[PDB]
Amino acid sequence: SLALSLTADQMVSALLDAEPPILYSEYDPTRPFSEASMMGLLTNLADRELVHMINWAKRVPGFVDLTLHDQVHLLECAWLEILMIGLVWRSMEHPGKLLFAPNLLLDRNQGKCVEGMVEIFDMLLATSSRFRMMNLQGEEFVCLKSIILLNSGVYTFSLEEKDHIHRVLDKITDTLIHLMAKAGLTLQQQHQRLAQLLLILSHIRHMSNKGMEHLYSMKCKNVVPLSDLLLEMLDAHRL
């Protein structure tokens, strides 16, 4: 297989080059928000981000080796997690603020403009301060984001196949350890940091579950219209 014969530095190189761009919103700073227009702004942004995420997933080493059916399942399961960790990563250098877009930097008090959204904001912000606390590196981030894509839906699947996905996961694990070894970390410090990073994904899954329920609430409310792709990704979670 392709991703099987890949050195640690080459793994990082491939992931870094596969990174999607940072998109802009249609935000006009000369006005306050409502509840609908902001969700309209955030939906319009998330929908365009999805297109780049989907083409990004193809460039993730080992993903294209999977069947079309399995590719669909993994993305349907992890799309919000990946959107969220990207958001958290963009917001690292902006304490107390969430950088949805370079022209859209929101704090906790603007999240209140949408009902119940400030809860998700707090968790996202706490995750961002956690990344800043750990001094998360760009090389580590792209590894984590690829792990989410492959791991989040692997348990919901002859079936192995499976073993290929886990083999790729193990390859990304070797890569993270390789990175930490370069940063001067001892054996003990590498295992610890590895553990700390992977435990973040638990909270990321949590935020995604809460966020998914929030979007489903938005849909039925007919508050504001979701895009047709965003609806399909939402319906996939059977909420």
Partner: peptide
């Protein structure tokens, strides 16, 4: 699925 089509090309 739109996800299908986007994953195709």
């Amino acid at each position: 699925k739109i996800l299908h089509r986007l994953l195709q090309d």
